[PDB]
Subunit: 249 residues, 4 copies
């Protein structure tokens, strides 16, 4: 029997590439999405086309609420329903927008940023662990957590909490054989709304090659961490940033 | 005229000492509390018996919710109402209990621990910044954030986000002359629930002195960080642990 | 054309496993050693038996001195001599003994611990860069921030290795050279250590209550020098089973 | 009886401020220097004109060689001979220049930067500890240890090693009551040879004020760390950088 993997926010960009590669490795995937219903579905269609019944979709909002614990348990549940097992969880879904200190209200901002980046990953880990070889969770972190974007404080707090969850969960879930690790991109696929002038300014800052990471480059770190080549690695966070975090002001 | 400072969860223990020492320095203090009402009024009495009209009390629940932004704004507004100014905010109040991955429900456990330790300090920082000449914020952190206690995931996640806030708030509030900094205790006042055998067990781990810190010793770093001796210090976290975090397993 | 790798202190233990792994991946290796002459050669025979003209030995002391720059240039040189090219450098050789503040003279201890753990790696990096998927892998320590008692000099050299890994990555990026690290917690324990002492250490490890096998440390090195890491540089990968996360 | 302190490379700039400040505090100081003879002697005169028998000088080259251990032993000795005690050690002397990986030969470059920044501090610490109440060492570090200058390999290797000495020594010397701590400037006094265009360029990168630190601001961190307000503090490194380390590329 093949193994299975939940990948959150897998309809587009880095998440898509993670799923495509995990699928290519022989994993049966659960494709989580929120708004991108069309891309999510046509991907699962594409993945099923060359291996029958190996992909399923699952929609949830991961924003913080009194219903998030239930939302998160269903996503883990979907994997056991579809495939009868859950071997890998990839926490990838993420809200990313400015929240300056000086349309959405602040309580919405808090819920969306802390919810997607930290709280949901925590509950998804709880469910993952409680529903239980090569079992392992992978969190998509940030290489620049200590040299952050201006006015992106709430986002930063969430990414900082993701590091704390990764280390905490790694410690607790080790006696059960569950490895928790992280993958921290510097600058990868730039936001779809980013203009070519502001995209290239960030490129010129990258020591290794003067470009952003492909999604496939980030996905390769995930594959390594879930492979049998990482049987002794837990609580680790792998930067994939082309040395960008080493560059001073 | 005397400067004014608000210290959260300051009825008892480490917060008490921080307010006491800030008062002795010459500050007018706001003593925020949650449950410990009787100790909060008793402290305000002693501080006003020393100097008339220099201390006020302010009850608030810092548990995460949609009304918290208003709660945190209120606390900042009590200070501006009592003393006509707010110079220093000390984020001290914190929930601390285990939340295992394998009475209170998880959505309560999330709201309390991420609320008190991270989100509340973020909202207080907004209101402080908003209401605005040696201006500084001091967040009470944790030295052991990278070697956390077992089954203490939500708390650790919170404390980690406080590092992210201290870092991001410092950078953004820098052109307004507001310094954001942190103080990280190893083991200080041990919890009231802990037995004498378990407290001793932790004391023997400490390299410097084989004992915990007094709250006076934690407060001392706070006074430093808000003094005119730290004018160029911002985004810094002063570990006050007696080398505890250096000890390997 | 088969690619070529230099691996320091590769006669036995972790270094031997990194050489064996790189050979099986299809690399031509340079087995460096200090005192273990018989083991380095006996390894080279076993690798040349599988593939003719693929392994060589190279002796050098990496203890700091005014001749060390030359010693290191020669190790690089022996690679270009035997194989015509130099693709990978694994900084693995390391002195490890207590040097308390309160047999060897202090200036020997300094020489051996700072030379092998930091200064030699720095020099091999210059020579590797000067002589030119090119990548350097520096073997570090997961416990650099939670050090062993009375082991100051060792920790100083391991801390300086992190510093080199970062600074080299930054400068050698425009040349397409990737500098990275693998940081073991507790792996193959000293020869040399008692059995009751080794069990006390094993019981500390969250994942398995065992130390890392040499081959498990080798796996992370194989990753960093592969095409799967094309974008990774200035990174240090903990391979420690959660050791660095355990409080006292 | 007044306490005594050793301060390396104390003739001009930062180390001069530490010395002057330690003097105003009440310490008897040993002004170490290497090449600034007139500057070191001139300072001793000004400090002695204030309080008689409080300031002496000690010339030494701290570049690494076989005769370095005895040199460092002699500096520690100077203090004990002039004052009959040694309470505080400030490791300040530092070589700072490029060492590209692609006049001075390489082995001379290794000797100076590693020697001044790390090996000397280790030997001075040994001798300080061997010779032995508020006993403390303070190492001058770098806030930018993780975002280094281009082609400053050896120097940055040195300041990294300095952080490891601060931690290993703090752990080992704790049973004795010797606290080892650090002070990490971002940009204080800029190099004398640096151009005013390049000086302003580094200044405008600083979040808090858009200017470098006064040497006296750095000194304030040293003073705090050797004081009774820092009794429980050991193994700590205080950044004093105006938030420079937090600014991304
Ligand atoms: N891109 C970079 O340069 C970069 C840099 C550093 C770190 N990273 C990290 O790597 C990961 C992937 O990066 P990315 O650029 O691919 O990110 P992204 O496109 O902005 O976000 C990934 C997905 O998360 C989902 N999502 C957003 N908000 C959600 C919500 N409130 N509830 C549930 N799902 C939500 C979205 O799916 P739907 O459209 O279907 O809603 C989206 O496709 C992220 O964790 C990110 O933080 C990326
Ligand atoms: N003590 C240590 O060994 C240690 C170690 C590391 C870090 N720290 C940090 O140092 C700071 C102070 O330590 P501590 O031991 O004095 O803390 P603590 O006594 O355990 O808690 C501090 C205060 O927080 C208030 N509080 C609790 N829940 C709250 C809520 N839901 N909403 C608003 N306020 C709430 C309480 O006030 P009421 O009683 O009035 O409800 C309490 O007095 C904390 O940030 C702590 O995490 C302490
Ligand atoms: N083993 C662990 O638990 C552990 C933990 C953390 C990090 N590491 C790191 O991983 C790497 C390998 O560990 P290991 O246990 O395999 O190492 P090791 O046995 O302690 O040393 C490896 C080799 O280094 C060479 N060497 C020693 N002193 C030298 C000198 N003065 N000049 C030149 N070469 C010298 C020796 O070669 P010869 O025998 O030929 O003389 C030795 O075989 C090391 O860099 C270490 O720092 C290991
Ligand atoms: N300036 C900055 O922006 C900055 C930034 C970060 C950290 N720091 C750290 O802060 C400390 C002081 O800074 P600084 O700018 O005042 O340093 P500095 O002016 O560059 O040099 C400090 C002193 O060290 C002595 N010295 C140089 N080479 C020596 C050698 N080979 N042997 C013995 N002594 C030697 C010199 O004394 P003589 O002139 O008498 O020969 C010099 O005055 C240093 O440890 C530095 O690493 C400075
Ligand atoms: N650009 C960018 C992003 C970053 C990012 C990239 C480069 C940075 C950064 C954040 O901090 C400073 O350097 N993080 C993101 N997370 C999500 N979910 N989506 C994104 O687009 C990004
Ligand atoms: N003991 C303890 C506490 C700790 C603590 C003590 C020792 C530790 C620790 C947290 O992480 C591992 O080592 N954090 C606390 N926070 C609050 N609010 N109250 C507490 O009592 C503690
Ligand atoms: N054991 C061990 C070693 C360690 C080591 C092992 C366990 C540790 C450690 C270092 O820090 C605290 O936990 N570092 C070494 N370096 C070399 N060169 N050779 C070794 O054997 C070790
Ligand atoms: N400028 C500068 C210096 C720095 C320095 C300044 C700015 C930096 C830095 C080091 O890291 C990147 O940003 N370190 C120094 N050490 C000595 N001994 N003397 C100096 O002048 C400096």
């Amino acid at each position: 029997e093949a193994p299975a993997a939940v990948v959150t926010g897998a309809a587009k960009r880095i998440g898509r590439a993670i799923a495509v590669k995990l699928h290519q490795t022989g994993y049966r995937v659960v494709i989580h999405y929120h708004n991108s219903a069309e891309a999510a579905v046509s991907l699962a269609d594409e993945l099923n086309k060359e291996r029958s019944n190996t992909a399923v979709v699952c929609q949830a909002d991961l924003t913080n609420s009194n219903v998030l614990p239930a939302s998160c348990e269903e996503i883990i549940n979907s994997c056991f329903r579809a495939f009868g097992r859950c071997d890998v969880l990839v926490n990838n879904a993420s809200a990313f927008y400015p929240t300056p200190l000086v349309g959405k209200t602040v309580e919405t901002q808090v819920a969306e940023l802390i919810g997607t980046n930290a709280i949901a990953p925590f509950l998804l880990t709880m469910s993952f662990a409680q529903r239980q070889s090569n079992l392992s969770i992978v969190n998509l972190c940030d290489a620049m957590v200590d040299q952050p974007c201006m006015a992106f404080s709430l986002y930063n707090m969430g990414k900082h909490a993701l590091v704390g969850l990764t280390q905490s969960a790694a410690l607790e879930l080790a006696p059960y054989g569950i490895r928790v690790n992280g993958v921290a991109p510097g600058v990868s696929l730039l936001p779809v709304a980013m203009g070519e002038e502001e995209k290239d300014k960030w490129r010129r800052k990258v020591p290794l090659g003067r470009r952003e990471a492909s999604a496939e480059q980030i996905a390769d770190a995930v594959i390594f961490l879930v492979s049998g080549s990482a049987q002794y690695i837990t609580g680790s966070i792998i930067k994939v940033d082309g040395g960008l975090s080493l560059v001073h002001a």
